[PDB]
Amino acid sequence: CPEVCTCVPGGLASCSALSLPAVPPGLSLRLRALLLDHNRVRALPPGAFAGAGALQRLDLRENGLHSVHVRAFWGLGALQLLDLSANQLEALAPGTFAPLRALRNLSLAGNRLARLEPAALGALPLLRSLSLQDNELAALAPGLLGRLPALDALHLRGNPWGCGCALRPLCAWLRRHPLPASEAETVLCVWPGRLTLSPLTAFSDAAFSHCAQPLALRDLAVVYTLGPASFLVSLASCLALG
Template sequence: MPQRQAGSEPCRTQVFQGGLAAALMRCLFFLSRLTPPLLLLLLCPLPVRAQAPTASAPSGTPGAQGCPEACACTAGGQANCSGRALPVVPAGLSWHVRRLLLDHNRVRALPPGAFVGAGALLRLDLRENGLRWVHARAFWGLSALQCLDLGANQLEALAPGTFAQLRALRNLSLADNRLARLEPATLGALPLLRALSLQNNELSELAPGVLADLPALGALGLRGNPWACGCALRPLCAWLRRHPRPAPETEALLCVSPGRLTLSPLAAFPDSAFSHCTQPLAARDLVVICSLGPVSFLASLAACLALGSVLAAWRARRRRRSAARRPPRRPPDPGSAPASPADLGRVAACART
């Protein structure tokens, strides 16, 4: 009896396997009668759904987290807002944005803190916006910014301290604007700035301290400006001699005034050509002179008052001493009568004899 039970187990297993095989065959026959598209959808739904987002990723994701709604952002941290007729800097900037493209829009002005929230920004492109006004604190908070393009706008002047906070800046373009003057306080001290584009503006000179605070500067775009070769251009000519340039670019830097120096190359002026120019006073010297002038005047006035007071006191004391040394005057005798004119005449007659 036990042997029969043990021998019947393989038989039951074979029966079960045979029934399962038959069921699988019936399922395959049923699936074979379905239409091919439906069959593919049933067999591989997951790969189709997984590939759909991958195909749309390169075009950017508008309105994603950390991305302005008017822009298209990518996973690399670029926010593309180019050519969207934006009148202001879009809101919603965050630390995820590394490159912000705002070129070919209508941003006419940059208010204070225009890029608040984008403290990790590395590149900012603001070309061709018709930009006319930039507040001195417009770029505050962008301490990591390395490249700033403000070219092809309508800037006529820049406030002092506009770029002073951009200590990591390496490339700055102010080309194709209307700048007539650039002060040292506008750029500030930019120790890492390597390239500065100033071509096609209305600059006739550069203030002496503009290039002094840019120790790493190696590329300077200057062509297309009405340079006046006077004493104010001495620092620029000295910088050009220390930084040789290609011949075509050097030949394009010409003076337009004064008359005797018209069309003279800027790089051809030696330092001896400015020997007639007086050395301008430094800002520290001006501060010392302006502070010493009023102080010295007040000191001399106080000294005069003190000396006059001492002299007046000395004279008064001298008068008192001389008055004390004089003998007192005797009062006239009340019993004596004044001499008459007859007596006076007899005295005179006696004197003659």
């Protein structure tokens, strides 16, 4: 019997609105399908639920989560739903969700990250859904998209986002999976011009604004010898003109 509130049949009954800075205290081995809405958790203690061998649903919504721990979720490798709505995370600690692989629905709404580490997130082959409601992220690593093999639901409504090269992987996800075609998903990006703005649906595949291509072999094969080529041209011209 937990001290926080009632436990009922099914996976289990959990408590929301506890707002504990670290974690609400629990003394049980049967708790399952946890509900942790409206908390003030800022860091997951290592091995928080290692006693629970199998878990199905965790509902960490509207938290003060700023940084997590690598070993918090060792004894947790069966979760299939998890929510990270309205956090203050700065960077995702590597190895946190790495033991997790059965997750399919992972909302990451309202996070405060400059960028996400592709190594920290994990492969997560079962993940297909991800949400970014009221998030302030502006630069996403393409490794996040690269490692996820089944992502087909990217909710993004609400972003202090800047239209540019950082949006190209997200535009690629849009053009391979047009979820923002729905009215619900209407994420916007701020154009380089501070006064103007443009929704993501305006950001076309070409989107000739800035930063066309970072790398190119057709020019890399000649750039190394371009300088010596020019100098030999100058030398030959000097020889021939006299």
